[PDB]
Amino acid sequence: HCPSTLYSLAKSLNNIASCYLNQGITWLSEILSVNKKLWEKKLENDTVYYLECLVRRYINNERERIRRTKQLKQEVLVILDFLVEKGSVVGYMSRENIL
Amino acid sequence: ESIDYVSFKEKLWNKIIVKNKPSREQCFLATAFQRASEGQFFVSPACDTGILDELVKDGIVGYEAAGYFITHDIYEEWALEKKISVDYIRKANNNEFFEKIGESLPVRRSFRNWISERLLLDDQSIKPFIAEIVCGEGISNFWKDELWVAVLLSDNSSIFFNYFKRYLLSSDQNLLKRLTFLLRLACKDVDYDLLKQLG
């Protein structure tokens, strides 16, 4: 529930903790789907930028498995609709690619 | 002095049951699951309009005035294991999977066989699934017991004690006690050599 947590995980998974990316998608999707007030609170700077990088890097590797597997697709779409809610062009185009 | 069981299983499924029609495989899977779900020997399946007659002429399915039934037991076990694989591929979350497959005793045996085979073939995707089950909540305890029986019967068994050490020890040894109960109940076999020596 602390927004500093979401910021820290998004920044870490992009460089120093990059070796956990496949599991990090689960951790982030969980945080965003349970803690509803994060959709309305003010975020730390660059949070959206790091999330854009993570999701775009994951889909580039995992495209076929995401298309063929319901649970992975639902987990990814939770981050993408959060990004589109905040007005991300990159998130929007990524949904139109996944569908 | 042993058989290549996987090749034998593959040849028999593809050449006897499927042949070349998807509609045959769909009909057979639905028939076996309906028997195991309703607790019935004779059933009336909702197949496509001529497939049960083709399976009766092949001798896989039998007919009597009370309904249709399956001739050999080994094929019914194999059908339930494939059905579990499909429900695993299509699930949204683990709780929905355990709700989908039901809870009757033939299904529990089929689940235990399926886990044991994934462990033997070293499919690493099962390890997160196992960890999610062993750590998770809301899942009824008898599913965890079937999983631990599968582990205790598998040659891999020692690895899991290295992974779950703190979980085994710290929680008042409660799981370790259940392991001894399951071990003494399920993991035993008849000693026909000693019976021969006793006459």
Side-chain angles (χ1 to χ4, degrees):
Chain A
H1 51 270
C2 284
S4 302
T5 308
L6 178 68
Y7 169 80
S8 302
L9 294 178
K11 187 179 179 184
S12 302
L13 287 165
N14 196 40
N15 188 23
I16 197 67
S18 181
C19 57
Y20 302 119
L21 180 65
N22 293 0
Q23 303 186 249
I25 298 298
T26 298
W27 305 331
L28 293 172
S29 191
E30 193 291 90
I31 285 165
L32 291 172
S33 58
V34 175
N35 300 278
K36 309 277 64 193
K37 295 71 37 193
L38 295 177
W39 295 65
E40 300 189 329
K41 287 182 177 183
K42 169 87 217 83
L43 302 181
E44 302 294 275
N45 296 294
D46 305 336
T47 305
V48 174
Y49 169 72
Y50 295 127
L51 287 172
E52 287 172 353
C53 297
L54 291 178
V55 179
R56 185 170 163 265
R57 193 190 311 289
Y58 178 68
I59 291 166
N60 189 239
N61 294 345
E62 226 64 18
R63 183 56 153 59
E64 298 89 343
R65 291 185 68 230
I66 296 164
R67 291 273 316 261
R68 303 273 284 201
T69 318
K70 184 172 176 179
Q71 179 169 346
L72 301 182
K73 202 175 184 181
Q74 289 195 327
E75 286 170 6
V76 172
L77 287 169
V78 169
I79 312 178
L80 291 175
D81 44 9
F82 175 86
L83 290 173
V84 173
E85 178 70 351
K86 298 303 190 180
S88 177
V89 180
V90 176
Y92 185 94
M93 314 210 39
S94 300
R95 293 201 308 195
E96 303 297 274
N97 191 293
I98 279 294
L99 296 167
Chain B
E1 205 60 5
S2 195
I3 53 157
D4 181 22
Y5 185 83
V6 173
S7 301
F8 175 78
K9 183 174 177 178
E10 281 277 27
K11 186 186 178 81
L12 295 186
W13 190 263
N14 293 276
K15 262 57 184 173
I16 308 300
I17 287 160
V18 188
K19 290 186 177 182
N20 290 303
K21 296 186 179 182
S23 47
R24 285 174 65 112
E25 182 160 37
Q26 296 307 128
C27 181
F28 194 72
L29 290 170
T31 301
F33 185 78
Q34 186 175 4
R35 305 221 305 163
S37 179
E38 295 183 17
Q40 282 286 8
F41 190 86
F42 302 108
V43 294
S44 298
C47 69
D48 196 4
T49 60
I51 281 55
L52 285 173
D53 315 77
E54 189 187 313
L55 292 169
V56 169
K57 287 183 178 78
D58 283 344
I60 301 165
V61 176
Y63 173 76
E64 189 160 323
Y68 300 84
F69 63 94
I70 294 177
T71 308
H72 310 287
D73 299 341
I74 189 70
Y75 292 134
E76 191 167 42
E77 282 188 4
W78 294 349
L80 294 179
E81 293 170 18
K82 276 186 178 287
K83 208 276 181 179
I84 289 169
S85 304
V86 170
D87 279 326
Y88 175 83
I89 289 164
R90 278 174 42 102
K91 54 111 181 153
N93 67 66
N94 298 330
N95 322 50
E96 188 256 316
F97 166 76
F98 288 116
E99 185 179 326
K100 181 68 187 299
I101 67 175
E103 69 180 50
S104 64
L105 305 177
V107 182
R108 300 188 200 178
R109 181 172 66 215
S110 304
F111 176 76
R112 191 174 66 228
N113 291 356
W114 178 75
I115 292 295
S116 303
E117 187 159 69
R118 291 297 92 220
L119 291 174
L120 179 173
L121 298 174
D122 301 320
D123 183 350
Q124 306 304 296
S125 68
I126 211 68
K127 184 199 38 44
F129 182 70
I130 296 185
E132 289 156 32
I133 289 330
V134 193
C135 302
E137 297 186 6
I139 298 162
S140 302
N141 292 261
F142 62 89
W143 295 119
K144 301 188 179 187
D145 295 354
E146 296 304 325
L147 169 59
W148 280 112
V149 174
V151 173
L152 291 175
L153 293 171
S154 73
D155 298 350
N156 299 74
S157 61
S158 57
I159 298 169
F160 295 88
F161 292 84
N162 305 0
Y163 220 47
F164 291 107
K165 178 171 178 180
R166 95 169 47 61
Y167 192 47
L168 290 164
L169 291 167
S170 65
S171 298
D172 197 33
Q173 300 90 59
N174 229 22
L175 165 90
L176 185 60
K177 293 181 184 185
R178 283 296 295 169
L179 261 60
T180 69
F181 184 69
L182 296 173
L183 187 72
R184 290 175 66 228
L185 178 63
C187 307
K188 300 191 76 178
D189 197 4
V190 190
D191 192 352
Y192 288 138
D193 295 347
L194 180 64
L195 289 324
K196 250 166 64 139
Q197 289 170 357
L198 267 59

